[PDB]
UniProtKB/Swiss-Prot annotation, chains A, B:
The keyword Repeat applies. It comes from Escherichia coli O157:H7. TPR repeats lie at residues 38-71, 109-142. Required for formate-dependent nitrite reduction. Not required for the biosynthesis of any of the c-type cytochromes nor for the secretion of the periplasmic cytochromes. This is Formate-dependent nitrite reductase complex subunit NrfG. GO terms for cellular component: plasma membrane. Keywords: Repeat, TPR repeat. It comes from the Bacteria. The gene is nrfG.
């Protein structure tokens, strides 16, 4: 060491993934106790998303959003559920939830990170890079910065290989 | 008025029916531009379905599904094409696409609405009602709720008439 292990803290879904009890009457009971609370339904949506119960996640998030009105974080969460439900393939429903999110908050990271990753999967590396750089530029405690650097360097490597295989060296 | 005309918004196939140009090189050109995109082939399938070109619709949707892998919305769309191709009669191909849809998403409304309507046409009103109620219970912006109420009341009327004609008053 030096010490040099590199200091690092949590994020905003690593904290949110404070699952791994496990039967949570808790979250439901607290909803029966108080039913008009936005963030309580969002937490239910979050639990179901972790369980990969996309149908039930969508229902809970939908209710959250009914109560709160238009809200970027909830638009981005819906988009996350839809995207995963479609096996991590973009979808018209997914893109519209993302577009609604970004209209309320141009720097909503959850939405930006879904867009980046999907650009990468569709080989639009230049868009992926641009988006991961936009996020990096936010200096946010939310995303591990070494992850962004690494994702960008992979997109760069894959761009070059594409350029080389297609003899497409310009842009 | 009051004003009392009753406020109401779109759905998810009323927006999708943003047909009624009309020659759409557009959709084809965009496929030639990018051929590995799932939702682009689905949109082609959707165009052809609107034209009632069931053969071409099936081809486009099949390709969409080849690319995306199992996906409830596309299973439900296939089932819609097959059902309409068979003049709105259930079919083994149709039921299997519906069963695949509902295995990926137990609340896929397109599949639920085909099942309900077909139950109605086969005089299984109790099943139709149960399905239309399940949809209603989803509190979804997708289906006009007054339509579900009306469809359920018709099934109720037709049930009673059947009970009366057959002297079958129990269930």
């Amino acid at each position: 060491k030096w010490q040099a292990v590199r200091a690092e803290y949590q994020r905003q879904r690593d904290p949110l993934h404070q699952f791994a009890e496990a039967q949570l009457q808790a979250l439901q009971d607290k909803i029966r106790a108080n039913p008009q609370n936005s963030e309580q339904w969002a937490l239910l949506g979050e639990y179901y998303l972790w369980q990969n119960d996309y149908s039930n996640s969508l229902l809970a998030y939908r209710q959250a959003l009914q109560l709160r009105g238009e809200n970027a974080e909830l638009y981005a969460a819906l988009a996350t559920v839809l995207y995963y439900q479609a096996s991590q393939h973009m979808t018209a429903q997914t893109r519209a939830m993302i577009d609604k999110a970004l209209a309320l908050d141009s720097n909503e990271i959850t939405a930006l990170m879904l867009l980046a990753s999907d650009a990468f999967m569709q080989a639009n590396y230049a868009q992926a890079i641009e988006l991961w750089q936009k996020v990096m530029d936010l200096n946010s405690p939310r995303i591990n910065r070494t992850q962004l650097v690494e994702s960008i360097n992979m997109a760069k490597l894959l761009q070059r290989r594409s350029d080389l295989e297609h003899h497409h060296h310009h842009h």
